[PDB]
Design a binder for this molecule. Structure first.
Ligand SMILES: Nc1ccn([C@@H]2O[C@H](COP(=O)(O)CP(=O)(O)OP(=O)(O)O)[C@@H](O)[C@H]2O)c(=O)n1
Ligand SMILES: [Cl-]
Ligand SMILES: [Cl-]
Ligand SMILES: [Cl-]
Ligand SMILES: [Mg+2]
Ligand SMILES: [Mg+2]
Ligand code: NA
Ligand code: NA
Length: 327
DNA sequence: CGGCGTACG
DNA sequence: CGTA
DNA sequence: GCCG
């Protein structure tokens, strides 16, 4: 088992679901306390279990696995012996965990904001609604739409959404394309949002595209919220439902076609897969990776990739299709 | 011990 | 600060 | 919390 998530296939469904879920609770709790290192270790340990070919049944099967030390191994031991880990259950029922989870789940609210509200004594969404002077426009939209945004987006919703985005994109710039990325490209059947990557085959033609797209979607009455020169939009969309509609989060990102492989790789995720890939690139290969390119800081050159396959090859990694990037 | 991804709005 |  |  290699130490980086980008070195191993991770399928969407696997054989250690309960164990990985418990470790991810501790990871999330570590994040709520600002402990990014512990969050990373617990996330990595969870991801290792996702990559295993069969269920862990005995503690000895953790021997030699990366990112399993005394703490993660004890969590697993207790789950194997008793079906429950007391530390995990204590986190789950704690007021701190439940409130930080509730608040950071709001669109427009991060750990720092949630923590400040928590220290001020706030605990419920209605607590926030009662004091709306403390809210940004983004947070107001996130709170108003919170119920709908808490409902999973279905893969069966995505196609109709992509069609309306394609229509607006085609008027904004004929020949521009829309590619589904994020979790649905990794095979997820549900998601928290839909992520789309937009480009044009003629380098440079995509400049100034996203304002034109957003203006057209807004004119069609489809935009319940957006932040408005820009290249990423985090918006709330009106999606039809039988006899009504629901609010859905949609992300739109424009890249020049020269950068499209990097943007596709970046936006397809998973989040942990991309952090691990960038860490691998820099620490093992001495190359700096982001959603724009892959930089050699010794030659001061950028790698001109034509595909995701190109990028994996340049990093000395076996290619992983999106469905195996579910770290 | 230091390090822990890297951007844009 | 928020977002991916 | 764990790796190197
Ligand atoms: N911090 C971040 C946040 C995001 N990303 C990248 O953005 C993609 C979509 O994020 P996303 O937030 O839409 C999560 P997704 O994987 O699509 O699942 P969901 O929407 O059903 O929850 C991720 O899969 C990563 O490639 C990242 O690199 N670093
Ligand atoms: Cl930490
Ligand atoms: Cl590609
Ligand atoms: Cl980036
Ligand atoms: Mg998504
Ligand atoms: Mg997204
Ligand atoms: Na949030
Ligand atoms: Na960095």
């Amino acid at each position: 088992m290699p130490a980086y998530a980008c070195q191993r296939p991770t399928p969407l469904t696997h054989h250690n679901t309960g164990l990985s879920e418990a470790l991810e609770i501790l990871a999330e709790a570590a994040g709520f306390e600002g402990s990014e290192g512990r969050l990373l270790t617990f996330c990595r340990a969870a991801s290792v279990l996702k990559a295993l070919p069969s269920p862990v049944t005995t503690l000895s099967q953790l021997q030699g696995l990366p990112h399993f030390g005394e703490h993660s191994s004890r969590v697993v031991q207790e789950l194997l012996e008793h079906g429950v880990c007391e530390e995990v259950e204590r986190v789950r029922r704690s007021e701190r965990y439940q409130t930080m989870k509730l608040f950071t789940q709001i669109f427009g609210v991060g750990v720092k904001t949630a923590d400040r509200w928590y220290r001020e004594g706030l605990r419920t969404l209605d607590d926030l609604r009662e004091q709306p002077q403390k809210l940004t426009q983004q947070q107001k939209a996130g709170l108003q739409h919170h119920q709908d945004l808490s409902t999973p987006v279905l893969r069966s919703d995505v196609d109709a959404l992509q069609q309306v985005v394609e229509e607006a994109v085609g008027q904004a710039l004929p020949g521009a394309t829309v590619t589904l990325t994020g979790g649905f490209r990794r095979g997820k059947l549900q998601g928290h949002d839909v992520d789309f990557l937009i480009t044009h085959p003629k380098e440079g033609q995509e400049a100034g595209l996203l304002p034109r797209v957003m203006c057209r979607l807004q004119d069609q009455g489809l935009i319940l919220y957006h932040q408005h020169a820009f290249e990423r939009s985090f918006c709330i969309f009106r999606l039809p439902q039988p006899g009504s509609w629901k609010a859905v989060r949609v992300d739109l990102v424009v890249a020049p076609v020269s950068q499209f492989p990097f943007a596709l790789l970046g936006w397809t995720g998973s989040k942990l897969f991309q952090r691990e890939l960038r860490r691998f690139s820099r620490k093992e290969k001495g190359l700096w990776l982001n959603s724009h390119g892959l930089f050699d800081p010794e030659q001061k050159t950028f790698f001109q990739a034509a595909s995701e396959e190109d990028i994996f090859r340049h990093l000395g990694l076996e290619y992983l299709p999106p469905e195996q990037r579910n770290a």
